[PDB]
Amino acid sequence: MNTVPFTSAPIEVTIGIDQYSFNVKENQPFHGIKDIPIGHVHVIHFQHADNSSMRYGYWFDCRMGNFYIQYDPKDGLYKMMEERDGAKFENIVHNFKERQMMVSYPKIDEDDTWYNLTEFVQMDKIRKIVRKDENQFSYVDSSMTTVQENELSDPAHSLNYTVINFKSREAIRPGHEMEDFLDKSYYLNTVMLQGIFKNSSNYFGELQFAFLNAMFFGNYGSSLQWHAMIELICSSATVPKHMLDKLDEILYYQIKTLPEQYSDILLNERVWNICLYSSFQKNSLHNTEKIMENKYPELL
Amino acid sequence: GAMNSSNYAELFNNDIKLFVDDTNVYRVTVHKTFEGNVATKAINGCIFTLNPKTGHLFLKIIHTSVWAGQKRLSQLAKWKTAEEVSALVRSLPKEEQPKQIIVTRKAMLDPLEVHMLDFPNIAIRPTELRLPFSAAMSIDKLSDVVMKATEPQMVLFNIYDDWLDRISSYTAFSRLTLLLRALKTNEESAKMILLSDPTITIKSYHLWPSFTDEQWITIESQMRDLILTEYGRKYNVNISALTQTEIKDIILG
Numbered sequence: 255m256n257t258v259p260f261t262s263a264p265i266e267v268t269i270g271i272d273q274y275s276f277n278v279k280e281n282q283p284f285h286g287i288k289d290i291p292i293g294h295v296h297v298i299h300f301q302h303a304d305n306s307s308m309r310y311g312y313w314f315d316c317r318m319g320n321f322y323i324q325y326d327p328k329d330g331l332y333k334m335m336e337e338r339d340g341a342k343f344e345n346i347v348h349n350f351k352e353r354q355m356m357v358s359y360p361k362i363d364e365d366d367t368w369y370n371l372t373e374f375v376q377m378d379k380i381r382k383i384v385r386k387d388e389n390q391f392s393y394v395d396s397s398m399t400t401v402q403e404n405e406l407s408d409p410a411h412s413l414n415y416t417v418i419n420f421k422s423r424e425a426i427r428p429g430h431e432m433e434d435f436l437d438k439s440y441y442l443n444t445v446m447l448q449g450i451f452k453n454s455s456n457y458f459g460e461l462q463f464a465f466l467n468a469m470f471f472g473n474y475g476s477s478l479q480w481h482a483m484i485e486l487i488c489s490s491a492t493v494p495k496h497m498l499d500k501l502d503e504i505l506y507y508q509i510k511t512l513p514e515q516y517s518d519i520l521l522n523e524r525v526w527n528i529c530l531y532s533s534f535q536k537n538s539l540h541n542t543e544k545i546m547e548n549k550y551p552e553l554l
Numbered sequence: 555g556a557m558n559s560s561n562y563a564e565l566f567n568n569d570i571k572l573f574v575d576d577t578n579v580y581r582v583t584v585h586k587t588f589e590g591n592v593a594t595k596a597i598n599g600c601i602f603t604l605n606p607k608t609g610h611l612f613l614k615i616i617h618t619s620v621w622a623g624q625k626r627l628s629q630l631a632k633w634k635t636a637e638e639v640s641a642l643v644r645s646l647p648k649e650e651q652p653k654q655i656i657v658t659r660k661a662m663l664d665p666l667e668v669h670m671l672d673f674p675n676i677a678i679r680p681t682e683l684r685l686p687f688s689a690a691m692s693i694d695k696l697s698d699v700v701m702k703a704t705e706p707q708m709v710l711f712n713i714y715d716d717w718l719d720r721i722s723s724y725t726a727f728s729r730l731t732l733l734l735r736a737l738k739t740n741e742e743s744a745k746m747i748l749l750s751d752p753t754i755t756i757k758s759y760h761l762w763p764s765f766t767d768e769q770w771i772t773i774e775s776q777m778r779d780l781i782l783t784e785y786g787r788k789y790n791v792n793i794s795a796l797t798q799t800e801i802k803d804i805i806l807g
Protein backbone atom coordinates (compact mmCIF):
# COMPACT_ATOMS: atom_id res chain seq x y z
CA MET A 255 0.00 0.00 0.00
CA ASN A 256 1.68 3.26 -1.21
CA THR A 257 1.76 6.79 0.26
CA VAL A 258 1.71 10.35 -1.15
CA PRO A 259 2.95 12.60 1.66
CA PHE A 260 2.30 16.37 1.76
CA THR A 261 4.99 18.80 3.00
CA SER A 262 2.13 20.85 4.57
CA ALA A 263 -1.30 22.34 3.79
CA PRO A 264 -0.81 26.15 3.86
CA ILE A 265 -4.15 26.98 2.13
CA GLU A 266 -7.70 25.67 2.73
CA VAL A 267 -8.54 23.16 -0.04
CA THR A 268 -10.81 20.27 -0.96
CA ILE A 269 -8.48 17.31 -1.82
CA GLY A 270 -9.74 14.51 -4.08
CA ILE A 271 -8.12 11.07 -4.28
CA ASP A 272 -9.88 9.10 -7.05
CA GLN A 273 -13.66 9.16 -6.31
CA TYR A 274 -13.09 10.28 -2.64
CA SER A 275 -12.60 13.82 -1.25
CA PHE A 276 -12.10 15.66 2.04
CA ASN A 277 -11.76 19.30 3.20
CA VAL A 278 -8.40 20.47 4.67
CA LYS A 279 -8.36 23.80 6.65
CA GLU A 280 -5.70 26.58 6.24
CA ASN A 281 -2.47 25.31 8.04
CA GLN A 282 -4.27 22.09 9.29
CA PRO A 283 -1.58 19.52 10.29
CA PHE A 284 -2.22 17.34 7.22
CA HIS A 285 0.69 15.27 5.83
CA GLY A 286 -0.90 13.18 3.05
CA ILE A 287 -2.67 10.01 1.92
CA LYS A 288 -1.66 6.44 2.84
CA ASP A 289 -2.87 2.88 1.97
CA ILE A 290 -3.20 3.77 -1.79
CA PRO A 291 -3.99 0.51 -3.64
CA ILE A 292 -1.19 -0.68 -5.90
CA GLY A 293 -2.23 -1.92 -9.37
CA HIS A 294 -4.24 1.06 -10.60
CA VAL A 295 -3.50 4.62 -11.78
CA HIS A 296 -4.73 7.27 -9.28
CA VAL A 297 -5.61 10.94 -9.51
CA ILE A 298 -5.05 13.41 -6.68
CA HIS A 299 -7.00 16.66 -7.25
CA PHE A 300 -7.54 20.04 -5.69
CA GLN A 301 -10.12 22.80 -5.45
CA HIS A 302 -9.07 25.80 -3.38
CA ALA A 303 -11.71 27.10 -0.85
CA ASP A 304 -10.89 30.81 -1.65
CA ASN A 305 -10.96 30.27 -5.48
CA SER A 306 -12.89 27.39 -7.14
CA SER A 307 -11.30 28.35 -10.55
CA MET A 308 -8.12 26.61 -9.17
CA ARG A 309 -9.31 23.01 -10.08
CA TYR A 310 -6.41 20.77 -11.09
CA GLY A 311 -4.71 17.49 -10.30
CA TYR A 312 -2.13 14.81 -11.04
CA TRP A 313 -2.43 11.35 -12.56
CA PHE A 314 0.20 8.99 -11.11
CA ASP A 315 1.04 5.33 -10.46
CA CYS A 316 2.95 4.57 -7.20
CA ARG A 317 4.76 1.67 -8.98
CA MET A 318 6.70 4.24 -11.12
CA GLY A 319 8.24 6.30 -8.25
CA ASN A 320 7.89 8.01 -4.87
CA PHE A 321 5.61 11.09 -5.27
CA TYR A 322 4.77 13.88 -2.80
CA ILE A 323 2.77 17.13 -2.80
CA GLN A 324 4.28 20.51 -1.84
CA TYR A 325 2.44 23.86 -1.95
CA ASP A 326 4.22 26.53 -4.12
CA PRO A 327 3.35 30.02 -2.72
CA LYS A 328 4.62 31.62 -5.95
CA ASP A 329 2.50 29.68 -8.50
CA GLY A 330 -0.26 29.32 -5.84
CA LEU A 331 -0.85 25.60 -6.21
CA TYR A 332 -0.20 22.18 -4.71
CA LYS A 333 2.52 20.61 -6.94
CA MET A 334 3.37 16.93 -7.35
CA MET A 335 7.10 16.14 -7.11
CA GLU A 336 9.19 12.93 -7.33
CA GLU A 337 11.63 12.05 -4.47
CA ARG A 338 14.52 10.07 -6.14
CA ASP A 339 16.07 9.19 -2.67
CA GLY A 340 14.12 6.01 -1.64
CA ALA A 341 15.56 6.06 1.94
CA LYS A 342 14.79 9.75 2.68
CA PHE A 343 11.24 9.19 1.33
CA GLU A 344 10.68 6.01 3.47
CA ASN A 345 12.04 7.93 6.53
CA ILE A 346 9.61 10.89 5.92
CA VAL A 347 6.54 8.63 5.35
CA HIS A 348 7.37 6.50 8.48
CA ASN A 349 7.51 9.70 10.74
CA PHE A 350 4.10 11.03 9.41
CA LYS A 351 2.40 7.59 9.80
CA GLU A 352 3.78 7.29 13.41
CA ARG A 353 2.27 10.75 14.19
CA GLN A 354 -0.99 9.69 12.29
CA MET A 355 -1.02 12.90 10.21
CA MET A 356 -2.26 11.03 7.05
CA VAL A 357 -5.77 10.15 5.84
CA SER A 358 -6.29 6.56 4.73
CA TYR A 359 -7.47 5.79 1.16
CA PRO A 360 -11.00 4.77 2.23
CA LYS A 361 -11.61 1.65 0.06
CA ILE A 362 -14.51 -0.69 1.07
CA ASP A 363 -13.32 -4.33 0.45
CA GLU A 364 -16.48 -5.19 -1.67
CA ASP A 365 -16.05 -2.07 -3.85
CA ASP A 366 -14.65 -2.40 -7.43
CA THR A 367 -15.70 1.18 -8.42
CA TRP A 368 -12.17 2.48 -9.09
CA TYR A 369 -11.07 -0.69 -10.96
CA ASN A 370 -14.27 -0.48 -13.07
CA LEU A 371 -13.56 3.20 -13.99
CA THR A 372 -9.82 2.67 -14.78
CA GLU A 373 -9.75 -0.94 -16.14
CA PHE A 374 -8.05 0.05 -19.46
CA VAL A 375 -6.32 3.27 -18.26
CA GLN A 376 -2.49 3.00 -18.32
CA MET A 377 0.05 5.61 -17.09
CA ASP A 378 2.11 5.13 -20.33
CA LYS A 379 -0.97 6.16 -22.44
CA ILE A 380 -1.83 9.16 -20.15
CA ARG A 381 1.80 10.44 -20.57
CA LYS A 382 1.22 10.48 -24.40
CA ILE A 383 -2.13 12.41 -24.07
CA VAL A 384 -0.52 14.77 -21.46
CA ARG A 385 3.02 15.58 -22.75
CA LYS A 386 5.54 16.53 -19.98
CA ASP A 387 8.31 13.94 -20.40
CA GLU A 388 10.53 15.09 -17.43
CA ASN A 389 7.74 13.97 -14.97
CA GLN A 390 6.33 10.40 -14.41
CA PHE A 391 2.99 11.99 -13.31
CA SER A 392 0.59 14.10 -15.43
CA TYR A 393 -1.03 17.49 -14.58
CA VAL A 394 -4.60 18.19 -15.82
CA ASP A 395 -6.93 21.11 -15.00
CA SER A 396 -10.45 22.43 -15.82
CA SER A 397 -9.15 24.91 -18.51
CA MET A 398 -6.73 22.75 -20.61
CA THR A 399 -7.88 22.56 -24.26
CA THR A 400 -7.62 19.54 -26.59
CA VAL A 401 -5.60 19.39 -29.86
CA GLN A 402 -9.02 19.22 -31.72
CA GLU A 403 -10.35 22.27 -29.72
CA ASN A 404 -7.07 24.23 -30.58
CA GLU A 405 -7.62 23.57 -34.40
CA LEU A 406 -11.20 25.10 -34.51
CA SER A 407 -3.53 27.72 -28.61
CA ASP A 408 -0.38 26.91 -26.46
CA PRO A 409 0.48 23.33 -27.66
CA ALA A 410 2.67 22.31 -24.60
CA HIS A 411 -0.39 22.54 -22.19
CA SER A 412 -2.90 20.59 -24.41
CA LEU A 413 -4.72 17.26 -24.09
CA ASN A 414 -3.53 15.21 -27.13
CA TYR A 415 -6.70 13.07 -27.40
CA THR A 416 -7.07 11.18 -30.72
CA VAL A 417 -9.00 13.55 -33.10
CA ILE A 418 -12.43 12.13 -34.11
CA ASN A 419 -14.34 14.09 -36.80
CA PHE A 420 -17.36 12.38 -38.50
CA LYS A 421 -17.15 14.88 -41.44
CA SER A 422 -13.44 14.46 -42.27
CA ARG A 423 -11.57 12.70 -45.12
CA GLU A 424 -10.18 10.33 -42.39
CA ALA A 425 -13.79 9.24 -41.56
CA ILE A 426 -15.08 8.98 -45.19
CA ARG A 427 -13.61 6.87 -48.03
CA PRO A 428 -13.94 8.49 -51.49
CA GLY A 429 -16.88 6.75 -53.20
CA HIS A 430 -18.33 5.47 -49.87
CA GLU A 431 -19.73 8.85 -48.67
CA MET A 432 -23.28 7.76 -47.72
CA GLU A 433 -22.14 4.30 -46.53
CA ASP A 434 -19.34 5.62 -44.25
CA PHE A 435 -21.41 8.61 -42.93
CA LEU A 436 -24.47 6.49 -41.99
CA ASP A 437 -22.43 3.42 -40.80
CA LYS A 438 -19.13 4.41 -39.08
CA SER A 439 -17.78 0.77 -38.98
CA TYR A 440 -14.92 1.63 -41.45
CA TYR A 441 -13.83 4.61 -39.31
CA LEU A 442 -14.12 2.60 -36.01
CA ASN A 443 -12.61 -0.76 -37.10
CA THR A 444 -10.01 0.13 -39.85
CA VAL A 445 -8.95 3.76 -39.13
CA MET A 446 -9.26 3.92 -35.31
CA LEU A 447 -8.94 0.30 -33.93
CA GLN A 448 -6.53 -1.36 -36.50
CA GLY A 449 -4.88 1.97 -37.54
CA ILE A 450 -4.39 4.24 -34.50
CA PHE A 451 -5.28 2.49 -31.18
CA LYS A 452 -4.06 -0.99 -32.38
CA ASN A 453 -6.69 -2.68 -30.08
CA SER A 454 -9.99 -2.05 -28.18
CA SER A 455 -8.10 -1.79 -24.81
CA ASN A 456 -6.22 1.40 -25.92
CA TYR A 457 -9.55 2.81 -27.27
CA PHE A 458 -11.35 2.07 -23.96
CA GLY A 459 -8.41 3.51 -21.96
CA GLU A 460 -8.61 6.87 -23.75
CA LEU A 461 -12.48 6.82 -23.42
CA GLN A 462 -12.18 6.14 -19.64
CA PHE A 463 -9.44 8.83 -19.17
CA ALA A 464 -11.58 11.37 -21.12
CA PHE A 465 -14.55 10.65 -18.79
CA LEU A 466 -12.49 10.93 -15.56
CA ASN A 467 -10.97 14.34 -16.69
CA ALA A 468 -14.55 15.52 -17.55
CA MET A 469 -15.88 14.38 -14.14
CA PHE A 470 -12.99 15.37 -11.82
CA PHE A 471 -11.93 18.68 -13.50
CA GLY A 472 -15.10 19.75 -15.46
CA ASN A 473 -12.79 19.67 -18.53
CA TYR A 474 -15.12 20.50 -21.44
CA GLY A 475 -12.85 19.10 -24.20
CA SER A 476 -12.55 15.80 -22.28
CA SER A 477 -16.38 15.59 -22.15
CA LEU A 478 -16.50 16.17 -25.97
CA GLN A 479 -13.92 13.35 -26.46
CA TRP A 480 -15.79 10.86 -24.16
CA HIS A 481 -19.06 11.45 -26.07
CA ALA A 482 -17.31 11.26 -29.53
CA MET A 483 -15.75 7.87 -28.60
CA ILE A 484 -19.22 6.54 -27.42
CA GLU A 485 -20.96 7.92 -30.55
CA LEU A 486 -18.34 6.34 -32.91
CA ILE A 487 -19.10 2.87 -31.45
CA CYS A 488 -22.93 3.35 -31.23
CA SER A 489 -22.98 4.67 -34.89
CA SER A 490 -21.15 1.52 -36.26
CA ALA A 491 -23.32 -1.44 -37.48
CA THR A 492 -20.30 -3.84 -37.17
CA VAL A 493 -18.67 -3.94 -33.71
CA PRO A 494 -17.12 -7.04 -32.10
CA LYS A 495 -19.52 -8.58 -29.44
CA HIS A 496 -16.75 -8.38 -26.73
CA MET A 497 -16.42 -4.60 -27.35
CA LEU A 498 -20.18 -3.95 -27.03
CA ASP A 499 -20.43 -6.05 -23.83
CA LYS A 500 -17.36 -4.25 -22.38
CA LEU A 501 -18.63 -0.76 -23.43
CA ASP A 502 -21.93 -1.50 -21.59
CA GLU A 503 -19.96 -2.26 -18.35
CA ILE A 504 -17.70 0.82 -18.80
CA LEU A 505 -20.62 3.26 -19.34
CA TYR A 506 -22.69 1.67 -16.52
CA TYR A 507 -19.95 2.41 -13.90
CA GLN A 508 -19.37 5.93 -15.38
CA ILE A 509 -23.10 6.77 -15.14
CA LYS A 510 -23.21 5.11 -11.64
CA THR A 511 -20.34 7.32 -10.36
CA LEU A 512 -21.43 10.67 -11.97
CA PRO A 513 -22.66 13.10 -9.23
CA GLU A 514 -26.48 13.53 -9.80
CA GLN A 515 -26.12 17.38 -9.58
CA TYR A 516 -23.54 17.50 -12.54
CA SER A 517 -25.65 15.28 -14.93
CA ASP A 518 -27.04 18.48 -16.66
CA ILE A 519 -23.49 19.79 -17.62
CA LEU A 520 -21.67 16.37 -18.06
CA LEU A 521 -24.19 14.47 -20.32
CA ASN A 522 -24.99 15.41 -23.96
CA GLU A 523 -28.77 14.81 -24.58
CA ARG A 524 -28.31 14.25 -28.38
CA VAL A 525 -25.54 11.64 -28.10
CA TRP A 526 -27.25 9.63 -25.32
CA ASN A 527 -30.72 9.73 -27.02
CA ILE A 528 -29.12 8.70 -30.36
CA CYS A 529 -26.92 5.97 -28.71
CA LEU A 530 -29.70 4.35 -26.58
CA TYR A 531 -32.82 4.85 -28.82
CA SER A 532 -31.74 5.46 -32.54
CA SER A 533 -28.30 3.89 -33.22
CA PHE A 534 -27.24 0.45 -34.54
CA GLN A 535 -26.38 -0.42 -30.88
CA LYS A 536 -29.70 0.93 -29.36
CA ASN A 537 -30.40 -2.65 -28.03
CA SER A 538 -26.74 -3.59 -27.16
CA LEU A 539 -26.26 -1.49 -23.94
CA HIS A 540 -28.76 -3.14 -21.51
CA ASN A 541 -26.98 -2.17 -18.23
CA THR A 542 -26.31 1.41 -19.41
CA GLU A 543 -29.91 1.93 -20.71
CA LYS A 544 -31.36 0.64 -17.36
CA ILE A 545 -29.16 2.88 -15.11
CA MET A 546 -29.70 5.92 -17.42
CA GLU A 547 -33.54 5.42 -17.44
CA ASN A 548 -33.63 5.02 -13.58
CA LYS A 549 -31.10 7.80 -12.65
CA TYR A 550 -31.57 10.47 -15.43
CA PRO A 551 -35.01 9.96 -17.09
CA GLU A 552 -35.28 13.82 -17.66
CA LEU A 553 -32.26 13.95 -20.06
CA LEU A 554 -33.94 11.16 -22.17
CA GLY B 555 -24.47 31.16 -42.18
CA ALA B 556 -28.11 31.04 -43.46
CA MET B 557 -29.30 32.79 -46.68
CA ASN B 558 -32.29 35.08 -45.75
CA SER B 559 -34.21 38.34 -46.67
CA SER B 560 -31.36 40.33 -44.91
CA ASN B 561 -28.58 39.07 -47.30
CA TYR B 562 -30.60 38.79 -50.60
CA ALA B 563 -28.35 41.10 -52.77
CA GLU B 564 -25.49 38.61 -52.13
CA LEU B 565 -27.18 36.36 -54.75
CA PHE B 566 -26.30 38.92 -57.51
CA ASN B 567 -22.68 39.78 -56.59
CA ASN B 568 -19.66 38.45 -58.60
CA ASP B 569 -18.97 35.40 -56.29
CA ILE B 570 -20.07 32.30 -58.30
CA LYS B 571 -22.86 30.52 -56.42
CA LEU B 572 -25.41 27.80 -57.12
CA PHE B 573 -28.78 26.94 -55.59
CA VAL B 574 -29.43 23.20 -55.35
CA ASP B 575 -33.06 21.98 -55.07
CA ASP B 576 -33.60 18.24 -54.57
CA THR B 577 -37.45 18.35 -54.38
CA ASN B 578 -37.91 16.69 -57.83
CA VAL B 579 -35.12 14.04 -57.56
CA TYR B 580 -37.26 11.17 -56.17
CA ARG B 581 -40.79 11.28 -57.66
CA VAL B 582 -43.47 8.59 -57.31
CA THR B 583 -47.12 7.81 -58.04
CA VAL B 584 -48.83 6.01 -55.09
CA HIS B 585 -51.26 3.25 -56.32
CA LYS B 586 -53.25 0.18 -55.11
CA THR B 587 -51.92 -3.39 -55.74
CA PHE B 588 -54.12 -6.28 -56.94
CA GLU B 589 -54.31 -7.47 -53.23
CA GLY B 590 -55.39 -3.92 -52.15
CA ASN B 591 -51.99 -2.93 -50.66
CA VAL B 592 -50.32 0.36 -51.65
CA ALA B 593 -47.17 0.54 -53.79
CA THR B 594 -45.10 3.33 -55.34
CA LYS B 595 -43.97 3.58 -58.96
CA ALA B 596 -41.02 5.98 -59.49
CA ILE B 597 -40.96 8.38 -62.45
CA ASN B 598 -37.99 10.32 -63.86
CA GLY B 599 -36.75 13.17 -61.65
CA CYS B 600 -34.21 15.99 -61.80
CA ILE B 601 -31.77 18.00 -59.72
CA PHE B 602 -32.38 21.76 -60.14
CA THR B 603 -28.91 23.46 -59.87
CA LEU B 604 -29.17 27.17 -60.69
CA ASN B 605 -26.70 30.12 -60.92
CA PRO B 606 -29.02 33.00 -59.80
CA LYS B 607 -26.68 35.64 -61.36
CA THR B 608 -26.40 34.16 -64.93
CA GLY B 609 -29.62 32.05 -65.11
CA HIS B 610 -27.52 28.96 -66.07
CA LEU B 611 -29.48 25.86 -65.02
CA PHE B 612 -27.70 22.48 -64.74
CA LEU B 613 -30.70 20.09 -64.97
CA LYS B 614 -29.42 16.61 -64.05
CA ILE B 615 -32.12 14.15 -65.12
CA ILE B 616 -32.53 11.25 -62.59
CA HIS B 617 -33.70 8.19 -64.51
CA THR B 618 -35.84 5.64 -62.57
CA SER B 619 -33.09 2.99 -63.17
CA VAL B 620 -31.03 4.78 -60.39
CA TRP B 621 -33.56 3.42 -57.83
CA ALA B 622 -33.60 -0.22 -59.01
CA GLY B 623 -33.03 -2.61 -56.07
CA GLN B 624 -32.16 0.22 -53.65
CA LYS B 625 -33.76 0.71 -50.20
CA ARG B 626 -34.65 3.92 -48.24
CA LEU B 627 -35.02 5.86 -51.54
CA SER B 628 -35.98 9.25 -49.92
CA GLN B 629 -32.65 9.02 -47.97
CA LEU B 630 -30.69 7.78 -51.02
CA ALA B 631 -32.13 10.67 -53.11
CA LYS B 632 -30.28 13.23 -50.93
CA TRP B 633 -26.92 11.38 -51.25
CA LYS B 634 -27.39 10.86 -55.03
CA THR B 635 -28.14 14.64 -55.32
CA ALA B 636 -24.92 15.42 -53.35
CA GLU B 637 -22.93 12.90 -55.51
CA GLU B 638 -24.18 14.52 -58.78
CA VAL B 639 -23.58 18.13 -57.51
CA SER B 640 -19.98 17.19 -56.48
CA ALA B 641 -19.50 15.47 -59.92
CA LEU B 642 -20.75 18.71 -61.61
CA VAL B 643 -18.37 20.89 -59.56
CA ARG B 644 -15.40 18.57 -60.41
CA SER B 645 -16.38 18.74 -64.16
CA LEU B 646 -16.22 22.59 -64.15
CA PRO B 647 -12.95 24.45 -64.76
CA LYS B 648 -11.56 25.87 -61.48
CA GLU B 649 -12.52 29.49 -62.47
CA GLU B 650 -16.17 28.31 -62.99
CA GLN B 651 -16.48 26.35 -59.69
CA PRO B 652 -18.83 27.97 -57.19
CA LYS B 653 -17.55 29.64 -53.97
CA GLN B 654 -20.91 28.76 -52.29
CA ILE B 655 -23.67 26.21 -52.78
CA ILE B 656 -27.05 27.12 -51.20
CA VAL B 657 -29.36 24.12 -50.58
CA THR B 658 -33.11 24.81 -50.53
CA ARG B 659 -33.65 22.01 -47.91
CA LYS B 660 -31.60 21.64 -44.64
CA ALA B 661 -31.60 17.82 -45.09
CA MET B 662 -29.18 18.35 -48.05
CA LEU B 663 -26.49 19.97 -45.82
CA ASP B 664 -24.72 16.85 -44.41
CA PRO B 665 -24.89 14.82 -47.67
CA LEU B 666 -23.46 17.73 -49.68
CA GLU B 667 -20.80 18.62 -47.03
CA VAL B 668 -19.57 14.96 -46.97
CA HIS B 669 -19.42 14.75 -50.81
CA MET B 670 -17.54 18.12 -51.01
CA LEU B 671 -14.86 17.37 -48.31
CA ASP B 672 -12.29 17.69 -51.21
CA PHE B 673 -13.49 21.37 -51.58
CA PRO B 674 -12.95 22.89 -48.10
CA ASN B 675 -13.16 26.48 -49.57
CA ILE B 676 -16.70 25.92 -51.06
CA ALA B 677 -19.26 27.06 -48.41
CA ILE B 678 -22.40 24.85 -48.10
CA ARG B 679 -25.27 27.07 -46.83
CA PRO B 680 -28.94 26.63 -45.99
CA THR B 681 -31.52 29.34 -46.74
CA GLU B 682 -34.45 30.83 -44.73
CA LEU B 683 -35.99 31.76 -48.16
CA ARG B 684 -38.99 29.51 -49.15
CA LEU B 685 -38.08 29.18 -52.86
CA PRO B 686 -40.61 27.72 -55.29
CA PHE B 687 -38.08 25.61 -57.31
CA SER B 688 -40.33 22.46 -56.80
CA ALA B 689 -42.52 24.05 -59.56
CA ALA B 690 -39.64 23.66 -62.15
CA MET B 691 -41.50 20.60 -63.49
CA SER B 692 -44.46 22.98 -64.36
CA ILE B 693 -42.17 24.50 -67.08
CA ASP B 694 -43.30 22.40 -70.12
CA LYS B 695 -39.84 22.14 -71.84
CA LEU B 696 -38.13 21.04 -68.54
CA SER B 697 -40.96 18.52 -67.79
CA ASP B 698 -40.68 17.18 -71.41
CA VAL B 699 -36.86 16.52 -71.30
CA VAL B 700 -37.22 14.79 -67.86
CA MET B 701 -40.15 12.48 -68.84
CA LYS B 702 -38.61 11.53 -72.28
CA ALA B 703 -35.16 10.59 -70.78
CA THR B 704 -34.25 6.87 -71.26
CA GLU B 705 -30.92 7.25 -69.39
CA PRO B 706 -29.11 9.62 -66.95
CA GLN B 707 -28.56 12.94 -68.82
CA MET B 708 -27.44 16.49 -67.98
CA VAL B 709 -29.24 19.29 -69.94
CA LEU B 710 -28.11 22.95 -69.79
CA PHE B 711 -30.68 25.78 -69.95
CA ASN B 712 -30.77 29.52 -69.29
CA ILE B 713 -33.87 29.84 -67.04
CA TYR B 714 -33.98 33.66 -67.76
CA ASP B 715 -34.08 33.22 -71.60
CA ASP B 716 -32.66 36.58 -72.90
CA TRP B 717 -34.08 38.72 -70.00
CA LEU B 718 -30.58 39.81 -68.81
CA ASP B 719 -30.24 41.79 -72.10
CA ARG B 720 -32.88 44.22 -70.64
CA ILE B 721 -33.05 43.66 -66.80
CA SER B 722 -30.64 43.04 -63.89
CA SER B 723 -30.11 39.56 -62.31
CA TYR B 724 -31.99 40.85 -59.21
CA THR B 725 -35.09 41.66 -61.34
CA ALA B 726 -34.71 38.41 -63.40
CA PHE B 727 -34.60 36.28 -60.18
CA SER B 728 -37.66 38.18 -58.80
CA ARG B 729 -39.56 37.47 -62.08
CA LEU B 730 -38.52 33.76 -62.01
CA THR B 731 -39.56 33.31 -58.31
CA LEU B 732 -42.91 35.07 -58.97
CA LEU B 733 -43.63 32.85 -62.05
CA LEU B 734 -42.64 29.67 -60.14
CA ARG B 735 -44.62 30.73 -57.01
CA ALA B 736 -47.75 31.22 -59.24
CA LEU B 737 -47.17 27.87 -61.03
CA LYS B 738 -46.80 26.18 -57.61
CA THR B 739 -49.97 27.83 -56.13
CA ASN B 740 -52.32 27.33 -59.17
CA GLU B 741 -50.60 25.64 -62.14
CA GLU B 742 -53.68 25.74 -64.47
CA SER B 743 -54.31 29.50 -63.85
CA ALA B 744 -50.58 30.38 -64.19
CA LYS B 745 -50.27 28.49 -67.53
CA MET B 746 -53.52 30.22 -68.74
CA ILE B 747 -52.04 33.69 -67.88
CA LEU B 748 -48.73 32.81 -69.70
CA LEU B 749 -50.17 31.13 -72.84
CA SER B 750 -53.72 32.72 -73.30
CA ASP B 751 -52.70 35.33 -76.00
CA PRO B 752 -51.59 33.10 -78.95
CA THR B 753 -49.78 36.03 -80.77
CA ILE B 754 -46.97 35.88 -78.07
CA THR B 755 -45.02 32.61 -78.63
CA ILE B 756 -42.09 30.79 -76.96
CA LYS B 757 -38.97 30.85 -79.13
CA SER B 758 -37.54 27.36 -79.95
CA TYR B 759 -34.43 28.26 -77.83
CA HIS B 760 -36.45 29.74 -74.86
CA LEU B 761 -38.56 28.44 -71.94
CA TRP B 762 -40.99 31.41 -71.47
CA PRO B 763 -42.95 33.58 -73.94
CA SER B 764 -41.37 36.55 -75.83
CA PHE B 765 -43.12 39.33 -73.78
CA THR B 766 -42.24 43.00 -74.40
CA ASP B 767 -41.29 45.05 -71.26
CA GLU B 768 -44.96 46.33 -70.98
CA GLN B 769 -46.45 42.81 -71.46
CA TRP B 770 -44.12 41.49 -68.63
CA ILE B 771 -45.58 44.20 -66.28
CA THR B 772 -49.16 42.97 -67.09
CA ILE B 773 -48.10 39.26 -66.72
CA GLU B 774 -46.30 40.04 -63.40
CA SER B 775 -49.50 41.80 -62.12
CA GLN B 776 -51.68 38.81 -63.27
CA MET B 777 -49.31 36.43 -61.35
CA ARG B 778 -49.38 38.59 -58.16
CA ASP B 779 -53.33 38.70 -58.45
CA LEU B 780 -53.36 34.83 -58.83
CA ILE B 781 -51.15 34.36 -55.72
CA LEU B 782 -53.54 36.67 -53.71
CA THR B 783 -56.75 35.24 -55.45
CA GLU B 784 -55.46 31.75 -54.34
CA TYR B 785 -54.34 32.97 -50.89
CA GLY B 786 -57.94 34.35 -50.68
CA ARG B 787 -59.74 31.10 -51.73
CA LYS B 788 -57.27 29.21 -49.40
CA TYR B 789 -57.91 31.17 -46.14
CA ASN B 790 -61.54 32.38 -47.00
CA VAL B 791 -60.26 36.06 -47.05
CA ASN B 792 -62.03 38.89 -48.95
CA ILE B 793 -58.92 40.02 -50.99
CA SER B 794 -60.78 43.12 -52.42
CA ALA B 795 -60.65 44.45 -48.75
CA LEU B 796 -56.76 44.28 -48.64
CA THR B 797 -54.45 47.38 -49.00
CA GLN B 798 -51.14 47.56 -50.99
CA THR B 799 -48.82 47.20 -47.89
CA GLU B 800 -50.59 43.97 -46.70
CA ILE B 801 -50.65 42.74 -50.41
CA LYS B 802 -46.81 43.29 -50.71
CA ASP B 803 -46.14 41.13 -47.57
CA ILE B 804 -47.96 37.85 -48.61
CA ILE B 805 -45.88 37.19 -51.86
CA LEU B 806 -42.74 37.67 -49.67
CA GLY B 807 -44.23 35.83 -46.62
Ligand SMILES: CCOC(=O)c1cn[nH]c1C(F)(F)F
Pocket residue numbers: 374375376377378379380381382383451455456457458459460461463464
Ligand atom coordinates in the same frame (compact mmCIF):
# COMPACT_ATOMS: atom_id res chain seq x y z
C1 LIG C 1 -2.80 7.43 -26.34
C2 LIG C 1 -4.27 7.06 -26.29
O1 LIG C 1 -4.57 6.51 -25.00
C3 LIG C 1 -4.44 5.08 -24.79
O2 LIG C 1 -4.14 4.39 -25.75
C4 LIG C 1 -4.64 4.44 -23.45
C5 LIG C 1 -4.65 3.09 -23.13
N1 LIG C 1 -4.85 2.98 -21.79
N2 LIG C 1 -4.97 4.26 -21.24
C6 LIG C 1 -4.83 5.12 -22.26
C7 LIG C 1 -4.93 6.56 -21.84
F1 LIG C 1 -5.06 6.60 -20.51
F2 LIG C 1 -3.83 7.21 -22.18
F3 LIG C 1 -5.96 7.11 -22.43
